[PDB]
A paper describes a structure:
Sterile alpha motif and HD domain-containing protein 1 (SAMHD1) is an important regulator of cellular 2′-deoxynucleoside-5′-triphosphate (dNTP) in mammalian cells. Although the HD-domain contains the active site, dNTP hydrolysis requires assembly of SAMHD1 into homo-tetramers. Using combined biophysical and X-ray structural studies incorporating nucleotide analogues along with mutagenesis experiments we have now discovered that SAMHD1 uses a bi-metallic Fe–Mg centre to catalyse dNTP hydrolysis in a reaction similar to those catalysed by HD domains in both human and bacterial phosphodiesterase PDE enzymes.
In addition, we determined the structures of two co-complexes of wt-SAMHD1(109-626), also in the presence of Mg2+, with (i) GTP (AL1), dATP (AL2) and dCMPNPP (active site) and (ii) GTP (AL1), dATP (AL2) and TMPNPP (active site). dATP was added to the latter two complexes to stimulate tetramer assembly, as dCMPNPP and TMPNPP are poor AL2 activators. Near-complete tetramerisation was observed with dAMPNPP, while dCMPNPP promoted the least tetramerisation and dGMPNPP was able to support tetramerisation without additional GTP, presumably by occupying both AL1 and AL2 allosteric sites. The most significant effect of dATP addition was observed with dCMPCPP, with kcat being increased 2.5-fold, presumably due to the limited ability of C-based nucleotides to induce SAMHD1 tetramerisation by AL2 binding. In the active site of the dNMPNPP structures, regardless of the nucleotide base, it is apparent that the side chain of Asp311 of the HD motif not only makes a coordinate bond with the bound active site Fe but also acts as an acceptor in a hydrogen bonding interaction with the proton (Himido) of the α,β-imido group of the dNMPNPP.
Residue numbers in the entry:
A (entry chain B): 114 to 275, 284 to 599
B (entry chain C): 114 to 277, 284 to 599
C (entry chain D): 114 to 277, 283 to 599
D (entry chain A): 112 to 276, 284 to 599
Write the structure that this text describes.
């Protein structure tokens, strides 16, 4: 029956038998072989951690929050059925991540198959369905009081989202949808686990207290719908939650070398895509890019693929294997510099393909010893936000006061502090050069710093040093 | 000989015999009986920690940074004499804190003796001098290669800045970086912060966002304007904005906690009422009061958090007024918090006007029926400045950076060059209002007066304002 | 109303209003001014922590364990009344500690008033009674469903055990005997008091803690043992329980009984003894009490805390000059000097009656070495320290009950043989430290010779450093070669 | 041009890697350790324990540097050069280069079963793989560039790892013998390898670590013992050293030898054995090697990691179906069932020669009620596990040298008597776990009866759960009542 398991982040947690049964399936255990931070392990040697253990922790925390809301407010009529369903959603929320997590849905699939709109979330829904059907879970759900028709829908809806649009639960339990993946503002237990866990393994202490948020969480009526509200005074801690997030993106998740290793692995997958077969349903053969179309195949597609390519001897894989071998020897593409747009210029995702052409096109006003072609440059554009593009997510949180804990309210940015961020979204543009040698790298720097001046981008931090002859050209930089 | 000591923050640290000798003196051991966070212990029950152990840690970290700079750059010619002097400064930097730390220099002395400009730092210099002279330290300094004339000046200068072109008499310009270790006047990045971040977090029950050890690995001395200064690596600029964010965050959560501060004001209140009647024997047997002990260091040595309990346990009828306040803190009959607000636009509230603000709150005429009128002496208004340690200025604009490709060439990094998600301003005010009358009827009235006062002075709407004063918040068009 | 409070060990904990009301009283807030580890702060500069915050944490953990037992086993019929009572006991379990905690009941009172048998626990009962009566708590207890007649008895009984075979407790019946094993476990010593201090003392000391209380709670269960419902642990956890008591003994060796920590304790105690006659503390009806007699009146004892140290230190009364001088020697670090450590051999316990006589014995030893300086008995301090697993000579795991996976209601026993050959052979020993009150180089050498000879004379273990400190004496003993 | 590199380890913080070390690190032979898990199958029981050999290897390298560097500051007379330091760091960094798939499963279970004729250790592999790393990545010129002498130093590095290829070492003279006690201490076992894994395994396992390496370093010192300079610890630290080995044994009991962790190890090993014949790995000159023979060629062994598990799991070849089915049973958690644990009594060791025979013995037991289901010997797994203080039956503290405060160059010994009566009596024992390959309710009951009888038959300790699982058998033994 109930099973205790020792997580270093959360301690000894209990898993209800139904959860154990879901956990002990190929579709779930698959997450033991997919790293949380993708290529980040190749920069932060602590970050060996995989999706499996994150997935357990999200499940656990989903349980804590829903269970706590129920103790504090019986009127909500949260059943142990609701609790199990929320735990299951949490547990299975990342079932559909690919090899190297965010590299797969974020870099690889968009390049290998531009026609498809595919997300790790959609994969989770599909893989959940596959897990359920192939391991006879529906009878076991019934055994512990679930109703598979309704509840499987509710679980899927928690993961990917949908008058009242949800078919899984009624409006009087809309708060249950704000636990595992919060579409309204982003404050969800997924974040809370990864903050704590990624910090543990990364070697960074975490600024944020989930346990305290749970103690000051409460359900109130907002616009004819019951939602999770936080206490008025906690507004500060919530701005700090999203700061913590952006901070972890800057330090670790978007680390300039972590990302170049990601682009190199992605590059290697693209060159191996044609030649690697993965057996799926009915014995049909799938490629790495097409395994997402069949979940029995996708079950077998993990970080393994990296080592399968690396260890191979097939001459068809030589191109892909050479890239991965350059990662072993640490002949990585070289970082040239970082820059941002100015004013209110967003760079459209359509234009990313075109940017290397632009860097090589720049004509710096001294004659150059080495010309470099566009295919020598990589430009990587990265969006940093508070999880809702240009919007302040705290403008989409509801609060309560000590003196009236059932009355929800709003808190604007003025009402909190003048020292908060002015905008909530920006872009970072990193430029790397594929040619490693001393002469090419100098040239690349000159092209880059000029390109920055040409497009009225911010001056590179190191710009005066790396390109001392170019930085006086721009009046705006002096 | 050398002594090893086990600090929970820093681990096993070595104390050079000279340091041990300074440590084992009444003037230093005094810091065992002064709490770091003052009244904060009465809100965060972890925060029992005292200045003693902070003082050791600052000393230790001062040593780490100067010692590391020396390994990485021999050309700087940092002597073991320089290292000891920097450690000593770090160790003794907080020697002059009063009872309840920041309550003393921050609330009490300014009220008891408005004529004096007195800082905890100035006290540290005076108390250092007293420690040296009364415990025969000068011969021991000489024994380990120091030159007391020069070095005592250098130590004092590290603590309070220049005692009177190059302003320092303690060291030459080619060692100006040594002045940026214990107390950094240029930008505020000093080892004092680094210890208290880690230590206060440990005891408070808050995890700390900031890695001092990493800063030390990417620290370096370079020439800036004919003067050798500590520079950080270009890419670390992000972590430095995050250092000051961490600081402001700890002020909001803990150091300026609304009840922590009201306990501070109540203790301060009790000291003021006991000031006339408590005698402290100083030099030559002269009798000093709590407010005047700062004028004589032998007296000040005996002035610690003890004073709280001396007042509490006393039986003298002259202390009954003061003792009653402290007894109300035991029973938890604290002054009640009404709400918080801020100015709008760019209106600073001058420190001269703080005395006048309770008069203003009671003066407000809210269009609500009230049973109970409240007089100005019933209100406490507390104005709190939150900044990045340099009033309105961005301290990162006063940091120097180096690049990987040229590690001796210093540069500057502007705010644009880093991120759009950084703060717009670097200084603000918080205005808390409390009410001395505790009952249900007075507290309601106080809320109405307060929320109206906010509307009257075009301050921000209190977060809870619609709930606590529902009849007043529609009056302001700007809030709808 | 309910109150959330942030402890660095346990996180955000909730305090029921009744608890808040008990907490916000002079008798309880007094614990803010008494240090957990006494003199240990003067050796481990992290250990500033006071009884107040320990007391909260014990209260909290008492709540967790009783609350968990209730979720896992409804049949036990644990009421929210039971829970509050257990929390209150936990919260108030250390109400009666004196200045510098264990120094007071352990060194000072036994010396100042040898006629009395007084424990910190008995004090807790008295001070609880005083807290209740002086702050009108009884109506508030009733308000939240307690029955003060029964429950105040139950609370006191948790703290000190039975107030007067049959069932000895008047506070609860036999079908709830497990409630008595939460705050202070007379059966085996596995209680939530230990669990808080392990974690907390480690946090502040700078030592990581080997023991997981949370795991014990997950594998705890109530079963019938000899017509009485007790807390049982899972069979496989037996290893972790031997490791709990090892952790405890380890913390005693490293920190609580640290050779200098203890000498600072003896010096403070010494100073209190010399100031005892001349310090007045006002009690009930204005009667004046001395430090040693404040334990007889709880209104006086309320005002007796670590303050007393500083009151003595800062004083100018010529009657206190003797006491003040000792405390001033602690500031300057002119501490009594450690000579060495030793143990008895075989199965010889040293009776507590004989402790007074041991300094006389050390000076009496006639070492065959030339000495400049004879030392009198009053120059030596001998400190005898018992190290055990909390139950004198007994193995406390022999007094634990266990359950198996296959039958979780059937209790069993586990012997020492059944666990491991690498466990301790005995569960109690003595340590004998000798210090010398004369500090100079010549006296310290002499003291070493007297000591190492005394060890040989009484067939004690050879001091670790013995060949170095007394090279001329160690060949005399055939048993050491 | 090539420069120092900073890297952020969660255990040790920001550590500096000298360019020579970076160059060794950035090679296929070293990066291979990213794909080998520290605790083997332990990840399948402690979901925190994802950590691999790579990051341990860095940390050992780092700590090797700290200890040697510290000894040099405190005692210049030893004349420790930056050349010595680099060599010690390199040894530390490369000490585990030769671990196989699932770390200790490979050298401990698999190879002994697949190839009983060979004596092969993970250490020997480290030496071979170090040689291969050096030669294939042109390291010798780079060593010279930073002042090493490859002839001498490569020998010294290898000798640190496996011991010696009168004074047996050719790598350094007797006046630097202490350098051999840093990465892998043959004398007593106190080495920086332990110190890293204690801290690291604890971090990831969810257990706090009882032991302070940093403190040991502050109280470490080199002294002359028997015409040879060795690392000595301070007299008073002897307690902490007994606690180091206790910590170690404690981590073995809780985690490394966890009853299910070990059964997953035996199942993976089982699957490798069934796949051994059919999986090819390309080595030097394109020769094909099997999993068991990859140890004979280091270019092949470079490609042999935990991958092999997934290669078997994902495969479609019908020749691998047997092996793949075992691994699939680990996914679904149809593990072999644990029956119970027991130990020998008196001083009876079970010889390693007799391990093959023990399943035969369990099935042979004739319990005095007739059994409905008979079980054959191949249905039982008996796993015998030695728990010690790292030196079989010996106390490693008897092989430590100590110094006193009063004479810090004079080494001494400290016996067990001189420390504590509460220390272990013996320093080595055996654990015998029995599992059953048949999972069903009827077979498991039978297995329990066979097992508990076998315990009685061989005069082993009574299983903790024995009264419950086999209530009809436990009264038969007079010794158990
Ligand atoms: N079942 C399961 N357990 C895991 C997993 N990861 C870690 N564990 C821990 O592994 C422990 C041992 O596994 P169990 O499956 O209980 O194996 P067992 O104890 O032989 O089988 P039971 O009789 O059912 O307890 C559990 O108690 C868990 O805490 C996992 O993926 N599945
Ligand atoms: N076992 C321990 N583990 C961790 N810290 C300890 C331990 N024992 C003592 N400490 C602490 C207390 C001190 O702050 C610091 C040094 O104490 P300790 O090593 O006992 O030196 P000491 O100065 O009393 O001995 P000596 O004078 O004999 O050199 O470490
Ligand atoms: N942001 C924070 N992070 C962590 N701990 C905090 C924070 N703010 C306060 N604490 C600690 C201090 C106290 O121990 C406990 C409660 O603080 P707080 O909730 O503000 O109490 P309070 O009595 O001021 O709230 P209330 O507004 O209900 O009266 O938590
Ligand atoms: N902001 C940070 N806080 C903590 N750790 C960090 C941070 N940034 C990076 N790390 C970790 C990852 C690596 O192990 C180590 C080195 O990171 P980084 O210093 O950015 O190396 P790098 O090689 O990218 O820099 P460079 O090429 O500029 O020398 O620090
Ligand atoms: Fe997630
Ligand atoms: Fe206690
Ligand atoms: Fe190792
Ligand atoms: Mg997701
Ligand atoms: Mg007690
Ligand atoms: Mg090894």
């Amino acid at each position: 029956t109930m099973k205790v398991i020792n997580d270093p982040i959360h301690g000894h947690i209990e898993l209800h038998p139904l959860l154990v049964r879901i956990i002990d399936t190929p579709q779930f255990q698959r997450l033991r072989y997919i790293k949380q931070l993708g290529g980040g392990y190749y920069v932060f040697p602590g970050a060996s951690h995989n999706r499996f253990e994150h997935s357990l922790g999200v499940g656990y925390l989903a349980g804590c929050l829903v269970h706590a809301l129920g103790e504090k407010q019986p009127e909500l009529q949260i059943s142990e059925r609701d609790v199990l369903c929320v735990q299951i959603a949490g547990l299975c929320h990342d079932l559909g991540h690919g090899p190297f997590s965010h590299m797969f849905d974020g870099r690889f699939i968009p390049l290998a198959r531009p026609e498809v709109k595919w997300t790790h979330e959609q994969g989770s829904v599909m893989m959940f369905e596959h897990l359920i059907n192939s391991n006879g879970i529906k009878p076991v759900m019934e055994q512990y009081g679930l109703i598979p028709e309704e509840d499987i829908c509710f679980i899927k809806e928690q993961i990917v989202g949908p008058l009242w649009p949800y078919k899984g639960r009624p409006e009087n339990k809309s708060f249950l949808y704000e636990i595992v993946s919060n579409k309204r503002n982003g404050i969800d237990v997924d974040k809370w686990d990864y903050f704590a866990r990624d910090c543990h393994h990364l070697g960074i202490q975490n600024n944020f207290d989930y346990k305290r948020f749970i103690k000051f969480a409460r359900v109130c009526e907002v616009d004819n719908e019951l939602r999770i509200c936080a206490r008025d005074k906690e507004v500060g801690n919530l701005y700090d939650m999203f700061h913590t997030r952006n901070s972890l993106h800057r330090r670790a998740y978007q680390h300039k070398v972590g990302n170049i290793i990601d682009t190199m692995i992605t590059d290697a997958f693209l060159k191996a895509d044609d030649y690697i077969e993965i057996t799926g349903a009915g014995g049909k053969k799938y490629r790495i890019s097409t395994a997402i179309d069949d979940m029995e195949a996708y079950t077998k597609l993990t970080d393994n693929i990296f080592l399968e390519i690396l260890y191979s001897t097939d001459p068809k894989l030589k191109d892909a294997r050479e890239i991965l071998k350059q990662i072993e020897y640490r002949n990585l593409f070289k970082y040239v510099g970082e820059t941002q747009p100015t004013g209110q210029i967003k760079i459209k995702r359509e234009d990313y393909e075109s940017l290397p052409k632009e860097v090589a096109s720049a004509k710096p006003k001294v004659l150059l010893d080495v010309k470099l072609k566009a295919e020598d440059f990589i430009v990587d554009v990265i969006n940093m936000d508070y999880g809702m593009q240009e919007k302040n997510p705290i403008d989409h949180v509801s609060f309560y006061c000590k003196t009236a804990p059932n009355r929800a309210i709003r808190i604007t940015k003025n009402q909190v502090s003048q020292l908060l961020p002015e905008k909530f979204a920006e872009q970072l543009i990193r430029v790397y050069c594929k040619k490693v040698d001393r002469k090419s790298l100098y040239a690349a720097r000159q092209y880059f710093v000029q390109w920055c001046a040409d497009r009225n981008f911010t001056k590179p931090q190191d710009g005066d040093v790396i390109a001392p002859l170019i930085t006086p050209q721009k009046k705006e930089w002096n």
